[PDB]
From a paper:
One enzyme, triosephosphate isomerase (TIM; EC 5.3.1.1), is of particular interest as an anthelmintic target. TIM catalyzes the isomerization of glyceraldehyde-3-phosphate and dihydroxyacetone phosphate in the fifth step of the glycolytic pathway. Structurally, most of the known TIMs are homodimers, each monomer consisting of eight parallel β-strands surrounded by eight α-helices that, together, form a typical “TIM barrel” fold. Because TIM is active only in its dimeric form, small molecules that engage the interface may interfere with proper enzyme function.
Residue numbers in the entry:
A (entry chain A), B (entry chain D): 2 to 251
């Protein structure tokens, strides 16, 4: 056994309204507390303050992105300073959609990580390969490059305690084609040893590597059983009552 | 001799905090700038609902950006549906920072305009040239390409009544390098002639084409005197109390 506490994230992505959210959050507060699972929701900026004040401090409330300075001439960007000013402590960075769709460079994710961590936030950097990269056998090549650019952004060694990595194969996002427990175990295993070789045994030992990619109430329990899977980043199912089931996957 | 109402918008960019927001809005709330001016304020997403909630219906409140679909798997994006949900009806689109730092194409700005107008919002699409395209003599070619891709996203001619153009030369943004009154008038005039030929005479004569880029209380009146400059998009000076004086420039 390791010292890794199970971590469940719910990424709402671009979904939500006053009326939709208030019902969702009630469901969430309705479930009994579980001191054994770290639970995060990542909500749209326009709701970020409002969600935070409608959920007990037990649950982490995250922004879905941020930028890399506190203030400045960046029309339409949000800083860690503004996230904290909204009562919040978490941010998701380098989600596949920001990298592939909005084109954000491995380098830019690096700088955002650096800045977020220097401002005392906790981060969830995402990695993973596209379908075309998996058909071409570049899964390992992709994850390694992405992870190298993440460590390059880490202010100090100790700040790894405020990082949770999520591996999300892009072919598994939205597609209903969840990685098998063996497929995910294979990548998570390779991530943890890469952290051993490229970072530090102590960092590899304590880091929660979470799986993302069509996580449902029907598949979460088999994935959570695997020894290198420390949790999930849930997309679609984060908006439904079953999210509660998925929080109870371990 | 025109029918066009004076328009002054304040783009706060990536600046704001609940504390400094209350201070700004008080200066603006307590004062009484000309009822002959449309006053717009474009705020960070995290504080959008609160600013609309605490600012008179005298004022417009805008998002600084949005995406081109109503809901979806676009981590980090805010839709027109969520902006309306927050009580707000305006969006800045194609700001220079959004085109040149964050990689938004002309085709993307066009499609965002399409989706925002379809959803009922009013839009402030932004066009202008960098210090190098001006030094290359391509101001016109650049602004025209920008204009054509905005026209392509107008779902029908009637929608231009919910459009205000902002011309902001990138070489004037946050530098103190204000366009001269004659440099603004010349570009605005040519933009209006482009409109006149490619859309309507009805659309050209009614459209506010506004200037931004180092607008301050000290230079606004000479720019506002020019007949095809119909107001402003103010950045830096929108955070200062002199924003009220720029609201009174006509």
């Amino acid at each position: 056994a390791s010292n890794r506490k199970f971590f469940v994230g719910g990424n709402w992505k671009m979904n939500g309204s006053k009326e939709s959210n208030q019902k969702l959050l009630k469901t969430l507060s309705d479930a009994k507390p579980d001191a054994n699972t770290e639970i995060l929701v990542a909500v749209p900026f326009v709701y970020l303050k409002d969600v935070r004040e409608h959920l007990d401090k037990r649950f982490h409330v995250a922004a879905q992105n941020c930028y890399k300075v506190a203030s400045g001439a960046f029309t339409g960007e949000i800083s860690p300073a503004m996230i904290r000013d909204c009562g919040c402590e978490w941010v998701i960075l380098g989600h596949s959609e920001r990298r592939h769709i909005f084109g954000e460079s491995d380098e830019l994710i690096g700088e955002k990580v650096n800045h977020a961590l220097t401002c005392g936030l906790k981060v969830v950097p995402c990695i993973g390969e596209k379908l075309d990269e998996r058909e071409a056998g570049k899964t390992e090549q992709v994850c390694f490059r992405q992870l190298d650019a993440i460590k390059k952004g880490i202010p100090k060694a100790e700040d790894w305690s405020r990082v949770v990595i999520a591996y999300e194969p892009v072919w598994a996002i939205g597609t209903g084609k969840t990685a098998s427990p063996e497929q995910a175990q294979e990548v998570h295993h390779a991530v943890r040893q890469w952290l051993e070789k490229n970072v530090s045994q102590a960092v590899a030992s304590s880091l929660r590597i979470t799986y993302g990619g069509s996580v449902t109430a029907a598949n979460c329990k088999e994935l959570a059983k695997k020894p290198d899977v420390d949790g999930f980043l849930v997309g679609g199912a984060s908006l439904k009552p079953e999210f509660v089931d998925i929080c109870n996957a371990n």
